[PDB]
Amino acid sequence: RGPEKIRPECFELLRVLGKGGYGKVFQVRKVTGANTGKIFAMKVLKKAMIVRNAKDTAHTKAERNILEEVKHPFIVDLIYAFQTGGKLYLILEYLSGGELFMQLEREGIFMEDTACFYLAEISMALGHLHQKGIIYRDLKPENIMLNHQGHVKLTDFGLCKESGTIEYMAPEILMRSGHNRAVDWWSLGALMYDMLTGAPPFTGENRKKTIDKILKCKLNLPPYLTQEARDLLKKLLKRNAASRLGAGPGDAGEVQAHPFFRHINWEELLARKVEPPFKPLLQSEEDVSQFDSKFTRQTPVESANQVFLGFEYVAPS
Numbered sequence: 001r002g003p004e005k006i007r008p009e010c011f012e013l014l015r016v017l018g019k020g021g022y023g024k025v026f027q028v029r030k031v032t033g034a035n036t037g038k039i040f041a042m043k044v045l046k047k048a049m050i051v052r053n054a055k056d057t058a059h060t061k062a063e064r065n066i067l068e069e070v071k072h073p074f075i076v077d078l079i080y081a082f083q084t085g086g087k088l089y090l091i092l093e094y095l096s097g098g099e100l101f102m103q104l105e106r107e108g109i110f111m112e113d114t115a116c117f118y119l120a121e122i123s124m125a126l127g128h129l130h131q132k133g134i135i136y137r138d139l140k141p142e143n144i145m146l147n148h149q150g151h152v153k154l155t156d157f158g159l160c161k162e163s164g165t166i167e168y169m170a171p172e173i174l175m176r177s178g179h180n181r182a183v184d185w186w187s188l189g190a191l192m193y194d195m196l197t198g199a200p201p202f203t204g205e206n207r208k209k210t211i212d213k214i215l216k217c218k219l220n221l222p223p224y225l226t227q228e229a230r231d232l233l234k235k236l237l238k239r240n241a242a243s244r245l246g247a248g249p250g251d252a253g254e255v256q257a258h259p260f261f262r263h264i265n266w267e268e269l270l271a272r273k274v275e276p277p278f279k280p281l282l283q284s285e286e287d288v289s290q291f292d293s294k295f296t297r298q299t300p301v302e303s304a305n306q307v308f309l310g311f312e313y314v315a316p317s
């Protein structure tokens with residue numbers, strides 16, 4: 001009758017949210033103890049293959065450490081972490097709003113009024129990551145998800161699926177010239193562009209032809225844009241890192257003070273009091289309408305042991 005153990009047998013596998021090389025992401029229901037009947041996302045990783053590559057072991061541990069350390073409204077929360085021999089488990093909150101990119105397709109284009117909200121919430125998460133000395137490097141529409149009410153949540157701090165897309169990355173990543181916090185304000189710019197045009201600013205016929213267009217860095221001004229958004233974009237998508245907005249000593253604050261966010265109340269927005277532009281389909285909590293039909297499956301598939309010593313975690317709440 002002590003504290004709860006948190007084994008894999010504590011969860012019922014409902015469905016597959018994502019499959020990748022290193023493991024699987026399930027939608028699960030906690031069936032015993034504390035949160036009985038509550039829905040989670042469960043990331044399950046294969047120990048055997050993580051330990052083969054130091055860079056892989058890094059991101060797995062980083063994610064684990066990052067998510068324990070970071071508690072924030074616009075960053076996905078880690079509920080439990082535990083392990084078996086051969087497998088690692090991460091229990092994260094289930095985000096039923098799906099991808100933000102998903103809304104974009106349906107809308108075709110975001111209005112600046114709507115884009116602002118999502119960018120501002122993303123900006124808060126990004127600046128906080130920087131207060132914790134962390135650089136998302138590759139931020140892209142695939143990484144931004146929505147909670148049940150439609151608020152921003154940032155999500156893959158660990159391994160990569162399929163062992164991604166470069167058109168949202170800063171030129172300095174590609175030229176290996178070294179990077180910094182400003183790399184994300186670039187990626188934010190690339191996102192803003194995608195939000196208001198439907199496409200990334202620099203795209204090519206192939207892997208390298210895309211790369212060169214980014215390094216070229218040619219402005220493309222759609223006529224329907226306001227000067228605020230126009231000017232905001234030109235500062236974020238500056239090739240020059242030092243001259244980029246958010247690269248200064250004020251970081252996120254320097255970006256957020258922009259007249260494009262002149263209508264934003266941050267005290268309210270961070271409290272998540274502001275109504276999101278999209279309250280997404282509400283059939284039930286375990287509503288899975290937006291990810292599949294892609295994944296619809298339901299199945300779970302050693303010498304020098306440590307690492308993954310002290311991997312176990314349970315969020316205080």
Ligand SMILES: CCc1cncnc1N1CCN(Cc2nc3cc(C(F)(F)F)ccc3[nH]2)CC1
Nearest residue numbers: 017018019020022023024041094095159160161
């Ligand atoms: C866990 C956060 C989340 C919360 N709520 C609902 N949906 C979510 N996701 C967000 C992440 N996910 C994309 C994805 N990341 C993956 C990582 C792997 C890995 F094993 F790490 F290689 C494998 C497949 C993966 N699919 C879709 C389901």
